Symmetry: C2
Subunit: 300 residues, 2 copies
Amino acid sequence: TRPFTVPNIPLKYLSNSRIPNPIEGMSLSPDQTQNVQFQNGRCTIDGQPLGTTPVSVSQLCKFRGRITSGQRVLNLTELDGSPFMAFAAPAPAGFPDLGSCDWHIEMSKIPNSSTQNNPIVTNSVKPNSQQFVPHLSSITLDENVSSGGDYIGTIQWTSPPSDSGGANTNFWKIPDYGSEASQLAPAVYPPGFNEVIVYFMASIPGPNQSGSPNLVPCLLPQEYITHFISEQAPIQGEAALLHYVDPDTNRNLGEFKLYPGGYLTCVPNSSSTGPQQLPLDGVFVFASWVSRFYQLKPVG
Amino acid sequence: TRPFTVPNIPLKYLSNSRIPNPIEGMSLSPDQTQNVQFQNGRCTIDGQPLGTTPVSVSQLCKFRGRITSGQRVLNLTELDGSPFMAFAAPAPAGFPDLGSCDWHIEMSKIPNSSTQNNPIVTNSVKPNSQQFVPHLSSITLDENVSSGGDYIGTIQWTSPPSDSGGANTNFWKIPDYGQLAPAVYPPGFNEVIVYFMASIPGPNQSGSPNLVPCLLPQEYITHFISEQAPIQGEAALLHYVDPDTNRNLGEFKLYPGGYLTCVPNSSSTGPQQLPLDGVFVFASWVSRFYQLKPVGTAG
């Protein structure tokens, strides 16, 4: 019976699980009653990935598809060029889940066949548009692509969403996949007992209305998810009790519950306080399996 | 004593350890006896990173530094903005080690303070140029930078090196940094080093796939760093296993230094022939003299 483990690595060295960028911080949701329905960075702690969650940071917040010369319709594939059908997920593995914003994308043809010239095409996507239908293997870009072929790309930068009545960037949202998308990873809610969900923050370039850090929250560092996928440790409680340990002094900085559904909660010591003030060079370590009744020591 | 293990994940879901890009293939070197001296994707199998090798794909083939408005000199820090300690490493952790090419980069100021406009600045670096001195904590870009500040970026695309008598792109080579992980040689007994290939955008003179080689999947390196399994022989005998049938598809030696080897069954055949949906499984610790069953189709 394989014991449950999380990777023995300091947080500051681990990747966000919605964008392939280093974790800079832990944060609460602006409203702490708020639910999230992220499709990337979703994994049960016995190693079942949910929604669009890929295995590797190398497949995270990427898209692949065929576009016809001088046209705007990207016909989406899996990132290996395999056909995608949404029988089990809302979009291909890795597909971005960055809601309430415009995507300014970069991409290039695969494989390379060129002997000179810049292979990079920049373009943009309004995921609130009606022909944003990744659930049907299709999205339409804003500008025509001169050279047809097999394109792999990523979100280069984000901006507040178009045709939204001047709404700000809001990375706590996900896109509409459907037009109806049925295979979504379920929303996650704060599960009672004074507990709030903890989010791992990373920056992506892009302007926003406040001229502030452009931060994407996720539920779990990607390397945790890859661990769980390889390990497949059986769940033997209603939640996994975790310590955020300073690896130099061996001292516990905070008690946390990691629920079987793959989200982490804590009790903040106040609103002036919480995992926001914790250093980034701590290590999460499994203590024991507890019930959901289990009451945590306030953090901070 | 944590027994030695390798992640239970098919190769095709894993990342290159020199570029943050999915593994597409295994390949031998152009001369199959040639040494390599990659600074990224270097890690002992008991979990010691070597060279610039980062822990995460998130930090891989990336740079950060300060630029003054109207200058070309990028003064390097670590990726979190902390000073580069020039003496522990050849370059900040995750700094690209792609030699024998021009780098066409993209970068942006961190943190964002902007309310409109595109934040991406593009630019060029000749790593073979005079002022490519990362060891001395700076590189010089080809184009002036309008707007000074703290920049983080990556290699967007590669091209054959400038000022090189028209040499091709050679991803088997590193730049001169101006404390290197040591060179890796085939160890003998007709063993060749096995390389894991990923695509980065860019033209080459062959007009063919633009593939970077690396010694280990990054997820393998991250596991070793977490597990720190003690080394209990001169080599970790591995099997490349088809997880559907438990079929053994080939025997490999994983050296403590962090390179994989096989014996190719002929000059034109070997690991390049293997499917990418296998899993590497630790079998046993063996002596460096252990003779591998040759891999690949018989002559």
